Amino acid sequence: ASSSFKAADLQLEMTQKPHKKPGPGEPLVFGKTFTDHMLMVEWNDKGWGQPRIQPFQNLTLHPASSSLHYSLQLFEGMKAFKGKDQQVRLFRPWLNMDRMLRSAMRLCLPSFDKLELLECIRRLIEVDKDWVPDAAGTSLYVRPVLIGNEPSLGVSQPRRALLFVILCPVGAYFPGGSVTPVSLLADPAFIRAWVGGVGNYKLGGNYGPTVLVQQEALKRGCEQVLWLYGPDHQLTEVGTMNIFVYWTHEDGVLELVTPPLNGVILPGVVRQSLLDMAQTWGEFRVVERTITMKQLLRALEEGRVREVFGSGTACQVCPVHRILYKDRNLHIPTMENGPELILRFQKELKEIQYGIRAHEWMFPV
Amino acid sequence: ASSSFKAADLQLEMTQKPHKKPGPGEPLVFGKTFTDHMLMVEWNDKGWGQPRIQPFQNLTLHPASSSLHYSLQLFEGMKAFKGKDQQVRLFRPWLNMDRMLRSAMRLCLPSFDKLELLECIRRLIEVDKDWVPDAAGTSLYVRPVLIGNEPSLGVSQPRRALLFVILCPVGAYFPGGSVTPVSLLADPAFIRAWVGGVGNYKLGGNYGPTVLVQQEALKRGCEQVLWLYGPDHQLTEVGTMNIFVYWTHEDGVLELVTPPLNGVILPGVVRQSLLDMAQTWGEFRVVERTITMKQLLRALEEGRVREVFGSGTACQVCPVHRILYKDRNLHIPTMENGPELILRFQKELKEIQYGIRAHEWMFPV
Numbered sequence: 144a145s146s147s148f149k150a151a152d153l154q155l156e157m158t159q160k161p162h163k164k165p166g167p168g169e170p171l172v173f174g175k176t177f178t179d180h181m182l183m184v185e186w187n188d189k190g191w192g193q194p195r196i197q198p199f200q201n202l203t204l205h206p207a208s209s210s211l212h213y214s215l216q217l218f219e220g221m222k223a224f225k226g227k228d229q230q231v232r233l234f235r236p237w238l239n240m241d242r243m244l245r246s247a248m249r250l251c252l253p254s255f256d257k258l259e260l261l262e263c264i265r266r267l268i269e270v271d272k273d274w275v276p277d278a279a280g281t282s283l284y285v286r287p288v289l290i291g292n293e294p295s296l297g298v299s300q301p302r303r304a305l306l307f308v309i310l311c312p313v314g315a316y317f318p319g320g321s322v323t324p325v326s327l328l329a330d331p332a333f334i335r336a337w338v339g340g341v342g343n344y345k346l347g348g349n350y351g352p353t354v355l356v357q358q359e360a361l362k363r364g365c366e367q368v369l370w371l372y373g374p375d376h377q378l379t380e381v382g383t384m385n386i387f388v389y390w391t392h393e394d395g396v397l398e399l400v401t402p403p404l405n406g407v408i409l410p411g412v413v414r415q416s417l418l419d420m421a422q423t424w425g426e427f428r429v430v431e432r433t434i435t436m437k438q439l440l441r442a443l444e445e446g447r448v449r450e451v452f453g454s455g456t457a458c459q460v461c462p463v464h465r466i467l468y469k470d471r472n473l474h475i476p477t478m479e480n481g482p483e484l485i486l487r488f489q490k491e492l493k494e495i496q497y498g499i500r501a502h503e504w505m506f507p508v
Numbered sequence: 509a510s511s512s513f514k515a516a517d518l519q520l521e522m523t524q525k526p527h528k529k530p531g532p533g534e535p536l537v538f539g540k541t542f543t544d545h546m547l548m549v550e551w552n553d554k555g556w557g558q559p560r561i562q563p564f565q566n567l568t569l570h571p572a573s574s575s576l577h578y579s580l581q582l583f584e585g586m587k588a589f590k591g592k593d594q595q596v597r598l599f600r601p602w603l604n605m606d607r608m609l610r611s612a613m614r615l616c617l618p619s620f621d622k623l624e625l626l627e628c629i630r631r632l633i634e635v636d637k638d639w640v641p642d643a644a645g646t647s648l649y650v651r652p653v654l655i656g657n658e659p660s661l662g663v664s665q666p667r668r669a670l671l672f673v674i675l676c677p678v679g680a681y682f683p684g685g686s687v688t689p690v691s692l693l694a695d696p697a698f699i700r701a702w703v704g705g706v707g708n709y710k711l712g713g714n715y716g717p718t719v720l721v722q723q724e725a726l727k728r729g730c731e732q733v734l735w736l737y738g739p740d741h742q743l744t745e746v747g748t749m750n751i752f753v754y755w756t757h758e759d760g761v762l763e764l765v766t767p768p769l770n771g772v773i774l775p776g777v778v779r780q781s782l783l784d785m786a787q788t789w790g791e792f793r794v795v796e797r798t799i800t801m802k803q804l805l806r807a808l809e810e811g812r813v814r815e816v817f818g819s820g821t822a823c824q825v826c827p828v829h830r831i832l833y834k835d836r837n838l839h840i841p842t843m844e845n846g847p848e849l850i851l852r853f854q855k856e857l858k859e860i861q862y863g864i865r866a867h868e869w870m871f872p873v
């Protein structure tokens with residue numbers, strides 16, 4: 144009664160202007176197409192209003208809105224998948240709710256009950272169940288967002304906020320049983336986040352500044368940015384992805400490594416999962432630890448590196464075959480080693496996500 | 509870039525819903541009250557549209573707007589002052605245009621011609637001329653904003669943007685001829701910007717994360733945050749203000765020092781001006797150098813510190829009498845030394861800003 148909105152009070156408003164779905168020919172470029180409905184909940188000094196599913200529509204915002212002046216905004220990104228039996232499922236939606244909540248706190252935005260939001264999302268996706276593609280490799284992208292909405296140029300804790308969710312079908316990222324590597328630009332010139340910063344939260348502010356760097360990565364001939372940090376150029380993340388390395392370490396032990404959640408990297412859901420899986424298999428050392436370019440160069444020379452890749456909801460797993468550093472093109476042997484591990488990861492997630500094998504990680508819609 | 513919009517094509521829609529000025533006894537709380545009109549220019553596939561002054565109104569934005577997901581937003585803050593002859597004037601508006609433009613480039617937003625925007629702003633202020641307060645110490649706050657407006661969840665260079673300006677009368681911050689100090693929280697726990705970061709640009713993303721820390725500063729019993737950086741806790745800025753110190757250095761020379769424009773600092777307009785003035789007077793060493801808490805502690809005990817303060821458009825100059833560091837309350841002698849330096853700076857700016865003495869820094873409206 145001044146804490147959280149409840150799914151039980153959700154309000155439905157089916158559209159009166161259904162939109163033509165992307166014909167079976169239609170491309171489906173990442174975030175360019177949206178479904179018919181959206182979720183919407185308002186918050187002010189009266190607590191949350193009633194959550195409501197409404198037709199997709201513009202946002203009406205006051206010119207002084209803090210979401211626009213002081214970046215009082217955060218968002219989440221997760222996927223729902225439709226299996227061959229056309230049942231739709233989310234991938235560990237809970238971890239996303241957690242993260243959203245944590246970001247919400249960092250920006251002094253109002254908290255809410257994750258189960259209620261999750262259910263509300265489940266109701267929304269349900270409403271647009273038809274928008275979920277089901278061609279192999281495709282999915283529905285779930286975009287929850289929360290922004291401060293005070294019509295005040297004061298940089299204070301907002302007293303008015305707004306949470307909303309939008310959905311878009313996304314097409315396949317790789318052919319059924321393979322993957323294609325990407326080249327990375329690695330330049331100390333740019334930092335993405337720092338210690339004591341806010342990079343371990345998914346806030347809009349973390350991304351705005353990457354657009355320029357991303358272009359520099361392309362003009363320089365690469366496709367993504369490997370973010371280096373500190374004086375030893377430690378690897379943090381690869382653009383909107385957590386970085387992983389499968390190699391024989393200096394101590395001669397075969398292991399899967401990924402930078403620790405110090406506070407400069409984002410707690411990827413896929414990231415978590417890949418560790419979970421690997422720790423399960425028990426076939427090799429799985430460790431969270433700092434990785435430095437130094438260690439990487441030497442591991443490359445002595446040929447101890449097998450696979451390098453990033454994790455993320457866009458493709459789950461993505462191979463790396465080239466890293467441009469100090470104007471030096473480093474060939475990464477990922478494809479030459481299978482990529483054995485990447486494919487397994489890829490294969491296991493697909494069977495879990497598309498409902499080939501039942502699993503606790505999947506939240507049915 | 510595209511060919512800037514031109515003032516000559518400015519389109520004017522006068523309001524039919526004049527809000528009525530704040531009663532002559534109504535608290536001009538910063539960023540709370542807005543005037544009747546706003547400026548608005550759109551940008552897209554076809555370069556800039558026509559700039560237009562229109563009635564203050566909400567912004568209609570697509571749910572996927574990049575200004576809301578990846579913080580593709582920046583803004584500027586400057587003041588216009590009305591003299592007793594009712595002539596309105598801006599304070600070095602050019603430096604603001606420059607800065608705006610630089611921020612615009614860092615986020616890959618479209619460029620525009622500084623002079624055209626300035627004229628457009630001059631036209632808008634002209635239109636709301638009556639909204640500029642006359643009380644000594646008051647002013648009109650000018651808030652230009654530029655945001656990416658791509659209805660796309662893709663984190664790319666926008667192809668659709670929007671620039672707009674809103675205005676609000678602000679009341680006095682100090683009574684005439686005096687000032688009141690503020691206490692600062694100085695904790696290495698929090699970092700505002702980093703080297704190679706984007707703190708030297710006025711981007712919304714820089715601020716969102718300060719709201720929490722600001723509350724912690726009040727909770728700790730302070731009023732503003734002194735941002736410390738690096739391993740030696742070098743002073744960077746004091747919240748939305750540049751920090752200045754008037755002290756005898758370790759070499760025995762009396763000087764006014766302020767952190768250099770190394771990139772972790774915002775190029776304040778007031779900051780620039782205070783240096784210009786001091787440089788002019790030629791009465792003491794004026795320098796841009798790194799300042800470390802170490803140096804400050806030692807100056808305090810040896811008594812070499814006279815005045816400490818920050819610069820910013822909100823109050824021009826603001827005294828500091830206390831800095832809480834390591835749970836240690838440091839008394840700063842600012843008020844005990846006049847504060848002579850601060851008073852002079854405050855006197856000079858007032859006479860320039862309110863048109864008591866003509867000056868090249870003032871841009872008439």
Ligand SMILES: *Cc1c(COP(=O)(O)O)cnc(C)c1O
Pocket residue numbers: 220380382383384385408409410411412413414454455456457
């Ligand atoms: C999206 C993203 C990740 C990965 O998160 P997932 O939950 O796996 O989608 C990691 N780092 C950054 C900077 C990201 O944007």
Ligand SMILES: *Cc1c(COP(=O)(O)O)cnc(C)c1O
Pocket residue numbers: 585745747748749750773774775776777778779819820821822
């Ligand atoms: C507003 C601000 C300043 C001061 O700039 P002015 O142009 O003099 O107002 C300095 N640093 C930060 C972080 C600011 O927000």
